[PDB]
Amino acid sequence: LALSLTADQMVSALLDAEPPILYSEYDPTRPFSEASMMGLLTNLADRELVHMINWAKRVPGFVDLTLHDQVHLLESAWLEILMIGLVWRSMEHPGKLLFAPNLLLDRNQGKSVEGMVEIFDMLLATSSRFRMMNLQGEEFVCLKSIILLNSGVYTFLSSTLKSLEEKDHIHRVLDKITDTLIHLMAKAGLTLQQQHQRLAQLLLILSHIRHMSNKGMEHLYSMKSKNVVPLYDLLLEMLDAHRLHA
């Protein structure tokens, strides 16, 4: 059970669950100004989503939830999760965003699309903040898991017995991850005061990531009019897998 795991077990579980870093899909031997910037990012995001679902399934406690609740959590968090991942891998590239190892973009390369330069600036600022705090890999995987579990937990539709039990489980797992973050900081030499200060600093950054996701979704919604399968149904199909391959 997830609630039985120790701090070091939680960390190992999260580190092991980490998804791969994907590459942008474009011909390296052709003029760049030819390729659609938003086309490249959309394709990347869509491929990453598949791996995000595998990752979520390996976050302790996640698969203990109902399918419906798992979908709701990912539907609310997916863009924040993409964004915190980007910021993490951009940390050692000041002034640039490492969307993919073969797609490193600077501020001015977002002007091709509306609202993009503003979001790029916010993402760059978050990466600067992490660099400045010297964020560690173990801390990063805790934060990404907190995002998955927290972002949609205040927007649950139901209030049935089952929903109450679901929320309680989510909050117990979140408490576990808080314990894990504190543990990592204790093992890195920080005093108690430094521990709760750093915890608060990290969790306050999650509000900015929420803000970035909201602003991004504003523009994506003006932009995404494919009139096709709703994200919920797409997430469900991917999450609701058989065990005929297991």
- For position 63 contacting a copy of itself by CB under 8 A, the verdict is no
CB under 5 to 8 A by kind: which of a copy of itself, ligand L4G, none does 57 bind? none
CB under 5 to 8 A by kind: which of a copy of itself, ligand L4G, none does 50 bind? none
Q: Which member of 43, 104, 179, 190 binds a copy of itself (CB under 8 A)?
A: 179
Amino acid found at 18: E
Q: Is 139 annotated as a binding residue?
A: no
Q: Is 48 annotated as a binding residue?
A: yes
- Residue closer to a copy of itself (CB basis): 25 or 179: 179
- Residue closer to a copy of itself (CB basis): 169 or 210: 210
Q: Is 171 annotated as a binding residue?
A: no
d(CA 155, CA 135): 29
- For position 195 contacting a copy of itself by CB under 8 A, the verdict is yes
CB of 33 to ligand L4G, least distance (A): 18
CB of 217 to a copy of itself, least distance (A): 9
CB of 112 to a copy of itself, least distance (A): 22
Size of the residue set binding a copy of itself (CB under 8 A) = 34
d(CA 41, CA 25): 9
CB under 5 to 8 A by kind: which of ligand L4G, a copy of itself, none does 174 bind? a copy of itself
Q: Residue 150, Cβ neighbours under 10 Å: how many?
A: 20
Q: Which member of 10, 146, 148, 173 binds a copy of itself (CB under 8 A)?
A: 146
- Residue closer to ligand L4G (CB basis): 208 or 219: 219
Asked whether the CA dihedral 96, 99, 104, 108 is positive or negative, the reply is negative
Which residues in 59-95 are b (16+ Cβ under 10 Å) and which e?
bbbbeebeebbbbbbbbbbbbbbbbbbbbbbbbeeee
**CB-side neighbour CA atoms (13 Å) of 243:** 1
CB under 5 to 8 A by kind: which of a copy of itself, ligand L4G, none does 45 bind? ligand L4G
Binding-site residue positions: 48, 89, 219
Annotated binding residues for 17beta-estradiol, as ranges? Answer: 48, 89, 219
